[PDB]
Amino acid sequence: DTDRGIGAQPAAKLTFPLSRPLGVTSAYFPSSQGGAATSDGLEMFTRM
């Protein structure tokens, strides 16, 4: 981290990085695929 090349030293790097607003991906429908996932009423019962 040194200034010898110009002498002045660089402009702050993080100002634009610091600013980023949170990405907006709204709505969004989830996914079950993936593999086929059980559905049915039997799931509890088999377990019981």
Partner 1 sequence: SVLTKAIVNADAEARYLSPGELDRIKSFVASGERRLRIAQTLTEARERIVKQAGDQLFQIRPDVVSPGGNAYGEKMTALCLRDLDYYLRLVTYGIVAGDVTPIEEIGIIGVKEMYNSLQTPIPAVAEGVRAMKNVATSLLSGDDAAEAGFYFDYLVGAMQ
Partner 2 sequence: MQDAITAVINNYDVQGKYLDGAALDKLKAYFTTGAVRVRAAAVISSNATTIIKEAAAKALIYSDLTRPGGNMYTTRRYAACIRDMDYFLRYATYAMLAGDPSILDERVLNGLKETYNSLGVPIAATVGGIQAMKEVVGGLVGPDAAKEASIYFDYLSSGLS
Partner 3 sequence: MQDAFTKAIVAADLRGSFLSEQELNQLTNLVKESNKRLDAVNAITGNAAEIISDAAHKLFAEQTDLIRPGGNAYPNRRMAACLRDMEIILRYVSYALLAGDASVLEDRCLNGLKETYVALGTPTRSVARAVQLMKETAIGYVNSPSGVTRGDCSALVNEAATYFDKAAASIA
Chain positions contacting partner 2, by CB under 8 A: 26-29, 41
If we measure between CA atoms, which residue out of 17, 9, 11, 13 comes closest to residue 1?
9
Cβ 23 to partner 2 shortest distance, Å: 16
Q: Fill in the per-residue mask, 6 to 25: x = in contact with partner 3 (CB under 8 A), - = not in contact.
A: --------------x-xx-x
Q: Fill in the per-residue mask, 29 to 48: x = in contact with partner 1 (CB under 8 A), - = not in contact.
A: ------------xx-xxx-x
Residue 47 has which token pair? 């377990």
CB atoms within 10 A of CB 44: 8
